[PDB]
Amino acid sequence: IKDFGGFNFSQILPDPSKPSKRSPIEDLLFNKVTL
Amino acid sequence: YTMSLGAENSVAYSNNSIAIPTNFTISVTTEILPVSMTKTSVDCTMYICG
Ligand SMILES: *[C@@H]1O[C@H](CO)[C@@H](O[C@@H]2O[C@H](CO)[C@@H](O[C@@H]3O[C@H](CO)[C@@H](O)[C@H](O)[C@@H]3O)[C@H](O)[C@H]2NC(C)=O)[C@H](O)[C@H]1NC(C)=O
Ligand SMILES: *[C@@H]1O[C@H](CO)[C@@H](O[C@@H]2O[C@H](CO)[C@@H](O)[C@H](O)[C@H]2NC(C)=O)[C@H](O)[C@H]1NC(C)=O
């Protein structure tokens, strides 16, 4: 239960839905860096 | 086998609870650093021709 007094860490904490288990910001970094 | 990253625990977070220590320990740790290496010299002429 994520009740941190109003602060919201969803964009930096891991995403259970995705199979990679990577946060929303980390996924854009991995997509953005392609050979 | 597959690597294990460490023991797993879950700190008991709550919005009106705190944890405070009641004792202490004093620890001594070691750290090692190299500062120099051997001073060597080579005379090219004697090495190559001789
Ligand atoms: C904070 O931690 C220290 C240890 O880091 C505690 O001191 C330790 O206290 C125990 C029990 O009083 C000592 O063990 C006993 O020692 C007697 C010798 O007097 C021996 O006959 C017993 O069989 C038993 O082994 C222990 O030696 C002692 N440690 C040191 C380094 O003196 C201290 O009590 C802790 N403080 C609090 C408030 O909990
Ligand atoms: C933390 O912020 C995120 C991002 O705004 C919130 O996620 C949104 O939640 C609303 C309501 O559930 C949805 O309509 C949005 O589509 C969500 N946005 C995204 C990008 O997923 C999240 O709800 C916030 N956390 C809390 C506890 O309110």
Curated annotation (Swiss-Prot), chain A:
Full protein name: Spike protein S2
Lineage summary: Viruses, Riboviria, Orthornavirae, Pisuviricota, Pisoniviricetes
Organism the protein comes from: Severe acute respiratory syndrome coronavirus 2
Glycan-linked positions: 8
Function: Precursor of the fusion protein processed in the biosynthesis of the S protein and the formation of virus particle. Mediates fusion of the virion and cellular membranes by functioning as a class I viral fusion protein. Contains two viral fusion peptides that are unmasked after cleavage. The S2/S2' cleavage occurs during virus entry at the cell membrane by host TMPRSS2 or during endocytosis by host CSTL.
Site positions for Cleavage: 22-23
